[PDB]
Write a protein that binds this ligand. Structure first.
Ligand code: HEM
Ligand code: HEM
Ligand code: HEM
Ligand code: HEM
Ligand SMILES: O=C1NC(=O)c2c(NCCCc3cc(O)cc(Cl)c3)cccc21
Ligand SMILES: O=C1NC(=O)c2c(NCCCc3cc(O)cc(Cl)c3)cccc21
Ligand SMILES: O=C1NC(=O)c2c(NCCCc3cc(O)cc(Cl)c3)cccc21
Ligand SMILES: O=C1NC(=O)c2c(NCCCc3cc(O)cc(Cl)c3)cccc21
Ligand SMILES: O=C1NC(=O)c2c(NCCCc3cc(O)cc(Cl)c3)cccc21
Ligand SMILES: O=C1NC(=O)c2c(NCCCc3cc(O)cc(Cl)c3)cccc21
Ligand SMILES: O=C1NC(=O)c2c(NCCCc3cc(O)cc(Cl)c3)cccc21
Ligand SMILES: [K+]
Lengths: 156, 156, 156, 156, 156, 156, 156
């Protein structure tokens, strides 16, 4: 089906963000696992898988709209050097992702691509859940202290 | 069955306390969940449900006695701004509630409304169990430290 | 996540309508049960539970958006003195509630809070189902007569 | 297999009656459900499905006989404005359908299309069962009164 | 519940498209079955059922909004004389249907009938899935050749 | 455990190849699915998953050896424009991948990193199986013809 | 099958390291159990069992090669006086063991005893997994503090 060219551009921008998130979350997961913080590693693994599923749906939508999905361009990963920074790097990426999702939904609504809007809204709901998770973890570090926070994330 | 007017007034006073407790505990529960203290959130949710069941039985009793249940007037919620304050606000409310239950039981006894007395005694038993829980939590905070106490209430 | 202040105000306005509905439907349910109209009592109970679940989701969303949920201010209950009035009071409340929901959705859309919109849309779907039920009940009273209508709601 | 041209015209006339009946019963069903008369709504839905199955078999036979099934021409639906009129409208349509079935069977017999006759006889048995149902409902309205009749059709 | 007059007109236009689709897809299905192309027959049958379910929901929504569903007016069916034409006829109908859905969604949005919009968005998702299927089939005919394409659709 | 710096560099080069392969195979899979060649799409999907698992093991090994896995640098994807080109592009990437694996194993052996060698040997066995598959597909296209080959890959 | 004499000498050296490891890990396990750190005790017990199984395979290989397995000479156990030291003593033993495994593999390769090499490679894989575990435990002590680390290892 011949899609709106600018919708396809927005879908590729969202996909670009997902590709960053896949790799950033996967690396964070395996760093946490290496450090013995296996509950964080498993949770971050599932975040990465969730972003892979989002990327799959975006690729499929772009192709249906007769666009070319961009899996070639990879923006800057935000990694960081300890648990607090890794969480804040994830949160910075998510806030950028949700900004782009909202701008994409505006445009889908304006050109009447209501199915693309529904897909992006579903993705945004997942990203807002991730934001809730991250903000909560950063708050917990403050409430229980870093030592206890990390302790509580050693065992799955 | 025509009830004693003052019994019905006592029952509506107890009901008023329950309506405060339902909302205060439900809000406390959701604040704790939002902060990632899900064991506290879950326990406080069950306390709110318990008060909902008490309120149901009082409403049913008032109607049987041919009175009008007062679900319109809501007294002051005691919310507080951190875990210790929230627990103490709950405890303050409970101690007011048990005082009111005792005065109502005295009056039921005097006018021979033994079934209303039995209902209020059952509610009083539940409220004293709540008081036991709350006093114990406040004492645990002192014994294990706030950070450990919160850590232990992160996961269900 | 820092929410739009007016979104939060709208969500609290919706929450305020739910708190009225919880109590109005609960009291109606227990009145109908006391009168032996247990099918009405049970259906109205489930309506009250529905509104409790809506209020829960609203409270959770307001807290995520870093607002304060208002569980303190309870507006006017619309009770009524017989079955037809009780149903009409529920319907008047629902029509106010759906008006407020639509206005809230407009503002969510305007500020790009698409997740709050989706939550409100889901609540609106539930409220329109309640309106369908209420309008149908009122029409059935006209078609079968009040005595038959009440007869048909004695038993579950 | 090359069918008799006039047999095919008869099958298309029967099919045309079925297409009217599908829509008329389906709309009646959904009207009754909307009014809270869900036992009538469910029964009328099953009448509509029955006519759909008849239409399928007619379409399949016409194609086997190398004719063109006519799904384009829709005759006048008989809707009516209350339960008694809706039942009478269905019955009027059914009596027209059974007259047309009888004439089609005569013709099938004359040209020795005994398999088409057997199909039409099966459909005629179904339609006489519908007529029995409709005549019985109209008679019940007279015997129990309209308010009781409708009351008995509120719940499935 | 009193619906918006122009929403009801849009819903009846959508329903009119569905009534065309139901019959067009049903006839196409039975033509393919008659020709021994049973996998196409089965798939097209399920498409027809899908449109029947959409029409049911539209009819129910129109009646809830106190409008009259139009099951009387049947537009032009697009049939076609061979497999390629039949698929292109379905695709032409679907492209008209999605245009009309998008215009109806615009109008529901403007009058704040967000529940009608959600229903129409769900129907639109289904129709874009049909378009995906149709465009894919027409493309497969080009890649594998007509004779192989038909061969692959003989057996369910 | 402090690894050999040049081993870690080899492992990061292998990982780099895997990241290309993940995206190339995933896009190919979704292109084939979009075109209705679902058997090719499913097989290529599982190839993508295989490379994801290889990348996981490489990341875990690099981190164990106290290196930094490179998920930032993405080399050129080889995307075909038709099935035969897509298969040849996969094959060209695989032949580069196995050359790099062999050179990495030579170096692992020279510095006695026998566990890293064992990991790479396992990956190489997988890649030779992929090469076997790809060479076999390209051969089949020649033996059965492209139209038949594509026909055989329509259905899962 | 008469083996290479220096292979057998290497296998006996590896066996000697395993006999030290068996006893050192078993004593550490029972020390941790005595101290109430039963999760550490259980994990170290399973490490001891692992080394017992390695020793068994070495004994079997040496006998097959017509050598005499040396179970008589026991080198110095590295015990240590607290958890951190005990883990470090285990890590120091493991690093000597893997050095010895690497030299043994070099010699097996030179004299073409590829089966002995494969056995040692499998043992080396196990020992590198132990090193991972130990390094991670030492890292966790730094990140969560010793008191939390030991707390998390009290219960299995
Ligand atoms: C374009 C980028 C990627 C896409 C579209 C993608 C897509 C997917 C999908 C759809 C799944 C199946 C998830 C499920 O249904 O449970 C999956 C699984 C997985 N992915 Fe990815 N992925 C991508 C990149 C990566 C990368 C870079 C890695 C690691 C470096 C990775 C590691 C994994 C793993 C380990 C699994 C689970 C496999 C299993 O054991 O079943 N993925 N991926
Ligand atoms: C007049 C005030 C209320 C009364 C009499 C009442 C009564 C009840 C009762 C009898 C139940 C069934 C519990 C059970 O038996 O398992 C219930 C459930 C529940 N209530 Fe309330 N309630 C009140 C107010 C509220 C409020 C204000 C909220 C939220 C703000 C709320 C949230 C809930 C929830 C989430 C459930 C569980 C529903 C489910 O999933 O089953 N209630 N309530
Ligand atoms: C040419 C006209 C039609 C034909 C030939 C037709 C045929 C059929 C058939 C063969 C079935 C399967 C019944 C079974 O064996 O269980 C069916 C189901 C159904 N039809 Fe139709 N139909 C027609 C028109 C319609 C219309 C106009 C509507 C709505 C206005 C409708 C609504 C339904 C529904 C709701 C179902 C059941 C779907 C389910 O089971 O979930 N049909 N139809
Ligand atoms: C301090 C000396 C040792 C101690 C205290 C010890 C202790 C144990 C214990 C408690 C078990 C588990 C028994 C069971 O399954 O119920 C076990 C199993 C075993 N041990 Fe030892 N052991 C020692 C030395 C050795 C040595 C020197 C060897 C071989 C050279 C060996 C080989 C084995 C084997 C093969 C098993 C069976 C484990 C399995 O496959 O499940 N052990 N040992
Ligand atoms: O990421 C990428 N998405 C792409 O479509 C793509 C390429 N398309 C070539 C045409 C395919 C029809 C070529 C290189 C890289 C990419
Ligand atoms: O692809 C990428 N791989 C990376 O490692 C990486 C980056 N690393 C910065 C240091 C992270 C770190 C800190 C630490 O204390 C321990 C460890 Cl293991 C790692 C930055 C951008 C992109 C990439
Ligand atoms: O909280 C509230 N409790 C109430 O009763 C109530 C109200 N009652 C109005 C009369 C309803 C009634 C009529 C009847 O015949 C029998 C019964 Cl039991 C009750 C109005 C506003 C608010 C409230
Ligand atoms: O209905 C009510 N809703 C309320 O919030 C509330 C009150 N809140 C005072 C501050 C509570 C708070 C502190 C905090 O540190 C974080 C959060 Cl989320 C909330 C007081 C009386 C009645 C009500
Ligand atoms: O399709 C049709 N929808 C209709 O409401 C309708 C009719 N309404 C009659 C009043 C209810 C009459 C004939 C045909 C139709
Ligand atoms: O209701 C309708 N019934 C119809 O047949 C029909 C139409 N037929 C067009 C001829 C296509 C055909 C070609 C063929 O080779 C075999 C067959 Cl059976 C049919 C056109 C519009 C509307 C209708
Ligand atoms: O460890 C030992 N292995 C052996 O074969 C052996 C002996 N054989 C004679 C005698 C004493 C000790 C040992
Ligand atoms: K602790």
């Amino acid at each position: 089906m011949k899609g709106d060219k600018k919708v396809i551009q927005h879908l590729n921008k969202i996909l670009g963000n997902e590709l960053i998130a896949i790799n950033q979350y996967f690396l964070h997961s395996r760093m946490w696992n290496d450090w013995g913080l296996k509950r964080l590693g498993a949770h971050e693994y599932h975040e990465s898988i969730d972003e892979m599923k989002h990327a799959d749906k975006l690729i499929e939508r772009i192709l249906f709209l007769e666009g070319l999905p961009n899996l070639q361009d990879l923006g800057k990963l935000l990694i960081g050097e300890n648990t607090q920074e890794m969480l804040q790097c994830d949160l910075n990426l998510e806030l950028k992702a949700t900004k782009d999702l909202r701008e994409a939904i505006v445009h889908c609504e304006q050109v009447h691509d209501y199915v693309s809007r529904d897909l992006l809204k579903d993705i945004l709901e997942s990203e807002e859940e991730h934001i809730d998770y991250l903000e909560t973890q950063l708050g917990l570090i403050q409430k229980v202290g870093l030592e206890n926070y990390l302790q509580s994330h050693m065992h799955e």
